[PDB]
Amino acid sequence: IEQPRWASKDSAAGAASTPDEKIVLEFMDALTSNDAAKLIEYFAEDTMFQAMPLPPAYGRDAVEQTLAGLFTVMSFDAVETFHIGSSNGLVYTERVDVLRALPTGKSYNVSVLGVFQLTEGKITGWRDYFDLREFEEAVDLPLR
Amino acid sequence: HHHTSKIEQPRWASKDSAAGAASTPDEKIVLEFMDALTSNDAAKLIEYFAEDTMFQAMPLPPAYGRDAVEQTLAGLFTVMSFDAVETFHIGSSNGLVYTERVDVLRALPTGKSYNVSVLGVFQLTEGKITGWRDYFDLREFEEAVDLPLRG
């Protein structure tokens, strides 16, 4: 994970400053477990998840199942957040996702900017924005 | 070709009236800049940018420096039009503004449009943009409007 030339050089750039931002960074770190049943405990009943190039899942069940599905084909290997901010109950994270395709054994660093919506310390919404094509090509695995 | 103007509120969008409005001076500059994008006028837009700045539509190579940004944005405006923007959420922290939007982009060679779901980050110092990065999927756009920007 190279520090992009545009990443802040401030020692606090990618660190938490509120309880909600803290919940997210911990949830981000937990992703490396590739355990949907574990991660769903971070989510509220009324929630949704969407990797924006792909369709969205609505409901705590749909999110768990979607994450489980993703984990049968891909390993969350590492994360680093270069910027984190929040406002009005939404947490934004500019980060890098190291993803590893199990069927083909290839890996690619995905530049991601995500948004989280939290109520009472639980996630009511999660959307990651990135380019799907370049990831697919780099790991020889189509996901659409 | 036809394409409707009304942009539907996503099911996941916040119904908090404050979520989509500017609460600080840095957030207001960004919303002004997002309304100024419909001008497709690099010369008008670069006035928002500092000398030490950068811009990158992440699926495409970045541009560093004020001159590079202007030429890159101008280049875009020869092939695509910026027809409309709606920002569902805008947030702010430690000099970085974030905006969850839909960019209604139209390909000039074909006349076709597409709603691009975008999440963006802006870096500001003294009210001038030192950085702008928009995260989205490019293939969705290329295929929808039949305008190839990457080979």
Author numbering:
A (entry chain A): 5 to 148
B (entry chain D): -1 to 149
Task: Cite, word for word, the article reporting this structure.
We report an in silico strategy for the biocatalytic synthesis of chiral N- and O-heterocycles via Baldwin cyclization modes of hydroxy- and amino-substituted epoxides and oxetanes using the limonene epoxide hydrolase from Rhodococcus erythropolis. We turned to cofactor-independent limonene epoxide hydrolases (LEHs) that normally catalyze direct hydrolysis of epoxides by positioning and activating water at the active site. On the basis of the well-documented mechanism of ReLEH, a water molecular is positioned by H-bonds to N55 and Y53 while D132 abstracts a proton from the water, enabling a smooth nucleophilic attack on one of the substrate’s epoxide carbon center. We have rationally engineered the epoxide hydrolase ReLEH with construction of a general platform for Baldwin cyclization reactivity of hydroxy- and amino-epoxides and oxetanes.
In curiosity-driven experiments, the mutants SZ612 (Y53F/N55A/I80F/L114V/I116V) and SZ621 (Y53F/N55A/I80F/I116V) produced only the Baldwin product 2 with none of 3 nor of the vicinal diol 4 as side-products. In order to gain insights on the active substrate-LEH interactions, the X-ray structures of the key variants SZ612 and SZ616 were analyzed. Consequently, the representative substrates in complex with LEH mutants, including the models SZ612‒(R)-1 and SZ616‒(R)-1, were constructed by molecular docking. Following the docking analysis, the epoxy ring O-atom of the substrate consistently establishes a hydrogen-bond interaction with the protonated catalytically active D101; the aforementioned hydrogen-bond network with water molecular is terminated by substitutions Y53F and N55A, enabling the substrate distal hydroxyl moiety to form a hydrogen-bond interaction with the deprotonated D132. In model SZ612‒(R)-1, the dihedral angle θ was mainly gathered between 0o and 180o during the MD simulations, suggesting that attack from the Re-face is unsupportive for SZ612. Moreover, for both of the SZ612 and SZ616 mutants, the slightly shorter distance d1 was observed during the simulations, indicating that the ON atom preferentially attacks C1. Furthermore, to better illustrate the bond forming and breaking in the Baldwin/anti-Baldwin selection pathways, the hybrid QM/MM scheme was employed, enabling the calculation the activation energy barriers. It is of interest to note that the shorter distance d2 allows a relatively low activation energy, and hence the formation of Baldwin product is favored for the two variants.
